[PDB]
């Protein structure tokens, strides 16, 4: 018999992004080919199968620094980190290959799906 | 020129609630008249003006235990904590007064608004 507030999840995500922009309560640095990205472990886990697996590990859950595979492109990661905190994906002809490869590595199934569809349309 | 994934914010909140249910990466205990509630500081801040103010304080941001005012009803808090993580509010005739008072103290403006409207309809 609950009532539901339609905009609540969006408002929560908007506030989490405000915290990220002001570097409030960020608890991890993600290192991508020497570029560094500060974030909230819980948000990373909520968006990515890879971060979910990492931060549920009894040893890795306590790390303040995570280094990604050197093949990962920092711009592709930045675009995906922005998507995690906003639901908005900056998908462009020049970045789609790097974004899809990063989303496959991060295990972000819905992003991989839209990249596959956008690539298929251009062939 | 971004594309947007409609269900992303809801999916994020659903995963944050899964983390709460399994007590994963919870970093604070909220004490309400001896009842204890584990949660994520970032989610509490994203939903409540009171928690936002508390955890942006340079001393309180580091506390692992927060004690609420003894007038706060544990059931009212529990209902609001469930709403924070799900967008669903269990508003009932028997709890509406305790839920509204707790939402006013927590500074959850949209919850206060629907409680005022539901009370006004019954008068």
């Amino acid at each position: 018999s609950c009532i539901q507030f339609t905009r609540h999840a969006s408002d929560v995500l908007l506030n989490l992004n405000r915290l990220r922009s002001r570097d409030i309560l960020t608890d991890v640095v993600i290192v991508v080919s020497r570029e560094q990205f500060r974030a909230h472990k819980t948000v990373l886990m909520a968006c990515s199968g890879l971060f979910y697996s990492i931060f549920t590990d009894q040893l890795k859950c306590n790390l303040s620094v995570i280094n990604l595979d050197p093949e990962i492109n920092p711009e592709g990661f930045c675009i995906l980190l922005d998507f995690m905190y906003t639901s908005r994906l900056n998908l462009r002809e020049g970045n789609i290959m790097a974004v899809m490869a990063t989303a496959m590595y991060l295990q972000m199934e819905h992003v991989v799906d839209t990249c596959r569809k956008f690539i298929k349309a251009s062939e | 020129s971004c594309i947007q994934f409609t269900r992303h914010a809801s999916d994020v909140l659903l995963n944050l609630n899964r983390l709460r249910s399994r007590d994963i990466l919870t970093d604070v205990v909220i004490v309400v008249s001896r009842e204890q509630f584990r949660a994520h500081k970032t989610v509490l801040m994203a939903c409540s003006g009171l928690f936002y103010s508390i955890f942006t304080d340079q001393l309180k941001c580091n506390l692992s235990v927060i004690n609420l005012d003894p007038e706060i009803n544990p059931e009212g808090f529990c209902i609001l904590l469930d709403f924070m993580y799900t967008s669903r509010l269990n508003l009932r005739e028997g709890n509406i007064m305790a839920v509204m008072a707790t939402a006013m103290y927590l500074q959850m403006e949209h919850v206060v608004d629907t409680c005022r409207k539901f009370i006004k309809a019954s008068e």
Binding site: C2, I3, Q4, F5, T6 | R88, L89, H110, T114
Partner: peptide, 4 residues
């Protein structure tokens, strides 16, 4: 607010 809605009935979900």
């Amino acid at each position: 607010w809605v009935i979900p």
